[PDB]
Ligand binder design. Sequence first.
Ligand SMILES: [Ca+2]
Length: 223
Amino acid sequence: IVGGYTCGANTVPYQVSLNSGYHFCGGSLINSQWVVSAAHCYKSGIQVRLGEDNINVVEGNEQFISASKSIVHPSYNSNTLNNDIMLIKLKSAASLNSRVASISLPTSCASAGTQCLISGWGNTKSSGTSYPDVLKCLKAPILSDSSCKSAYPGQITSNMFCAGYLEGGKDSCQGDSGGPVVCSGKLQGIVSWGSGCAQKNKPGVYTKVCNYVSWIKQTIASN
Ligand SMILES: [Ca+2]
């Protein structure tokens, strides 16, 4: 996250870290056994880390649970990042408490202008490299589809939305991939892509979760 703030320990209790020997992506806990992330974050051998604030220090609230299965969206296109969504099932159920809690799926798509909370452990610079150890947060509005399509001509599908600041300076970034965009207390987006981070006229692009609710519900009911 570039230009954000320190969330504070366990104020984003649905945020997870995906670990393959190192943190590589975020995700969101949607119930005690399932996490949503980006398909572009797929790898074999994922450990899900819940209740994290400082990813480099054990502070005592964490739960580390291996993934049993990963399910990439059946229409994911790695070239265009269309349908950039994946489900991860945990080998055992998380213990839900005040520090580890699930986030609701949307029944409805969020509106342009809605302020959303984006979080993660990604890069904090638009130029250069500085990774934080503690969870960062950013509030950012959803942009109109026309401003989104203007920013990324020919690249925005109906399964994507833009959120951020056209002036630049504030954005998600590498390492935040997979993480939540929460608006009005529901998971509305997944950190997906953008051109650089925090660049002028290049806002963040997010998977539009409301288009996937039927697939998520069907998949969890059968796996
Ligand atoms: Ca920790």
